[PDB]
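Here we describe the complex-level prediction in full. Unlike the single-chain runs in Section 2.1, the four entities below were treated as one system.
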Amino acid sequence: AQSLASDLLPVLDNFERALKIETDNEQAKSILQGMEMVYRSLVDALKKEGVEA
Amino acid sequence: MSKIIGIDLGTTNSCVAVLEGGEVKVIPNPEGNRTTPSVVAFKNGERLVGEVAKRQAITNPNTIISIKRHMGTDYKVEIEGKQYTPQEISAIILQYLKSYAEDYLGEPVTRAVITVPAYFNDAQRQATKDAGRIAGLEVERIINEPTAAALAYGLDKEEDQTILVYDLGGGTFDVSILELGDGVFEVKATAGDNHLGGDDFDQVIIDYLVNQFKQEHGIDLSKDKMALQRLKDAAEKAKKELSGVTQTQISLPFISANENGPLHLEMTLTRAKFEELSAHLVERTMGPVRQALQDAGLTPADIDKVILVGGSTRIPAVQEAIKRELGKEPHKGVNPDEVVAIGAAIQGGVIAGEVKDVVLLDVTPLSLGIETMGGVFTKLIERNTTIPTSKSQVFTTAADNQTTVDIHVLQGERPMAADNKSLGRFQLTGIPPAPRGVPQIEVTFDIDANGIVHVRAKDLGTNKEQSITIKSSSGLSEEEIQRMIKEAEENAEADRKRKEAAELRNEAD
Amino acid sequence: MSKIIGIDLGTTNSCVAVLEGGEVKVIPNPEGNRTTPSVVAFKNGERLVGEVAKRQAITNPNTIISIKRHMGTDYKVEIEGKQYTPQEISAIILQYLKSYAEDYLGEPVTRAVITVPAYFNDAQRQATKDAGRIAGLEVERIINEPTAAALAYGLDKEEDQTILVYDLGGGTFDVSILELGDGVFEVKATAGDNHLGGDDFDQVIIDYLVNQFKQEHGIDLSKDKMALQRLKDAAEKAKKELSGVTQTQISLPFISANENGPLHLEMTLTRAKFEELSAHLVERTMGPVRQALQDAGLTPADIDKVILVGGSTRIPAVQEAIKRELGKEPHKGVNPDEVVAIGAAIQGGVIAGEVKDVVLLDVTPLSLGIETMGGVFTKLIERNTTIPTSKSQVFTTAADNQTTVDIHVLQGERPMAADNKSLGRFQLTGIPPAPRGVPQIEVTFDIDANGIVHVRAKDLGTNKEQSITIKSSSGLSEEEIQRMIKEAEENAEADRKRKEAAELRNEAD
Amino acid sequence: MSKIIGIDLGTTNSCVAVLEGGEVKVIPNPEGNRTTPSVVAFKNGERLVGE
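The structure predicted for the assembly as a whole is:
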């Protein structure tokens, strides 16, 4: 699988980076209450393949 | 002489099993999914069937969906003006089952056994059977699914006894009861409602959800088919999940949104909330079961045991809720969605396993050979062999520059030349002044049909063919063989023979 | 005895090649990257080396670095009261090295070769050699990176002539001009710089960025550490792409954020542009070239061929400058990054005793098979399999009681008999009459180093057998060959012989 | 996969040779007769030919 998990980690990272964006305020945080799903998920994704952190 | 393929022809989707080895497996159809959905639609004048069918269903209004409800009745259906009959339809379905089973074996297949429900009749039966031949599958037999799914545990070889099969189909539900009398099935009662199934669960989940959503954030989801689907599926996966585990989380983020923007459907759900939330399917079920119970004159304790089928059947609450109103622990491990197809194939395997007769040919009851050099017996044809055959071997010069070679062709067992029976003794000359080494000689023993045995003796490079034929005359096969073999047993330490093997001594030239 | 592994000792990193087969693989280390960096640390009683040290570099007071500068000196360094010599350090590196190359092989490894920079002096060379035997590695020669690299192209066997190698590793650029007399190599001139490299090629980009991003959003990322980090990454990677393609995006979303919130760096970078920001480096790199040119009293004309070394010779403009410099094309045939350790491994090859096999004509020109039932051409030995080899397959008979089998040997790629070359035909007789598929028949093909191929067909109950030797399977112009390579595909759809599942109807019951 | 036999038919008489084993042997009539005689008949019920 590796090539992927590897070539994933920067993106799967941007998620950790974006995950804490919060200086924030409004309806936009809805957008980010959108991501901590996906990027709590990609984790379970790789996790199927047994890739932990 | 093809195997006998078992098939389970269902309302919702149908499944196809075969046995090779002491082992019986479930053939998959060209796509994933060991189980194939039963349906068909036509577009090109070319049929499409199985899932690739459900896919384009909504293009061509011509899609035949569960037909198997219409077999055995006058019914016909119009396709772009032309009328068809169930058996013809279900037939083409079969043309697929058989087809791709052929794909899987590379071995064309015909003989087959196909299964139909307990409640079916003579008419209907000759309708499936009909369909089968129509597809080109000669039927070896047709038998009723629950019985067939009794061959999971194959109880015919057990105590005469009364047994319930509880089948929850994908989109159906049925129950059956059969006393197994004289080793077979007097199918004592049929029952159960024709709109039921997983999806009738997957649903309550879907409902609970959407209603909960409109509830808190105020929109009715059934409106956009997008998140409709997302929902459906979600709920389903949630179903399978709660098959074994005690909680789960669904997300469906980015599902839809209000004026504060994007709206994320999330949640965590229990086992129970669903158990109770499913509690209606739950208690509506059994009516057919009990009504059947008196319907045969039998008491709840009158059963021996209770099978299962119907892959949706693997459920917490179904199970929990059954055996308790019943006799012992529901029977397991047979993987329900195929359980039935499994049964098919079993009974098919059996249908091929008919012929037990026996016959003749002939074994050449005593092993033949030539005195070899050094004065030993060396078999050229092991004892029980066959209708005429041939063997060929070589051997070479005795000692330096042989001119001539005997062949003593003897019939027996024991290692030791003289220690057996003999037969014609011939020789070969014409051999040149070739030193001991590689002057090779091919000597064969032909055999032909009735016990006649030719023999050949030939040198290689000079091509000299002098040879005999035995008349099978002198050799005694009445007793004499069934004697002089046991001789070989009594005396088997005759391996002492190796003496002359050791006598390789005079090979010092 | 053990394989003699070529080792390249880099100042920055060192890399290790060994020879199996006739071609040379290059041993990967635990990390999975080919080359491991030369740096060493100790914490307690433990030596760590290479990448895994280079990481803890900042937690360690003790991490020796770029030691290969001080090889050839009295320099010592102090850790745990204890001083160490280059021989001792680089010894350690060599230790890890040998250990992993062992690892790939697994039989222990006692015999190395080491390479050194073009200019190393006597006490230097000597001191590395030392380093190595401290390392426990008998050192069977020591050759200078360049003659090495040149050698893995082996031109050493070509005519007396003159080479110019240009090695630019990551941080430090070197040139050497070498004269080949007498299948023997002598270093005529050394040139270089110890601060120019690819790495600084990375720099100009990295800067150019933080200059565009200060000149827009006026935050200096250089000052954020890991921002430096991600930048460096993106830079190098964009250099890579920039080597073969004419543009690329660098894309770094969420680089940082102002008080306004999250900041996004994007961009598109040309080849043309990057060749702007770079053209001075390259043209610093014509300098030593010319320097040594004059040290040889020499002219471009003089230089006969040129080798390229180090990864960043993959840089398009670099090569460009080299071409409009000497008017001559660089021989890049081999992977310029490992070419050095590959040369090393070659010289240890010759040293420890596999000299050069010529080894040509090593392949079947075409697919060899024999017609089987229904004109189908069954492949046995495939096109482009190396010739000195043989294959053997067991066919049985067509029909019940078939007396005889007629083998048709065919050569081509095409799935139908008709379409292939009929090389020869012969038959075999006498097989015992008896049912189809029952008798064994073993045909073996055997091809000699010439391209001449013999076929033997031999019963397995008889040992009766017959054979032919197909004249040439050569002896004509390869033009036909390629015409068939083409003509194979030409008709791709001859796959219509699937028509033979029909002709698999032979089975009669 | 039954055997395949030769038969010569004519005025004078007919003779039937089959290949067995290595070579060809003729057959055996219900009586002797390496040659059976060209002719046949019946009166009532089953019939007969040859000599």
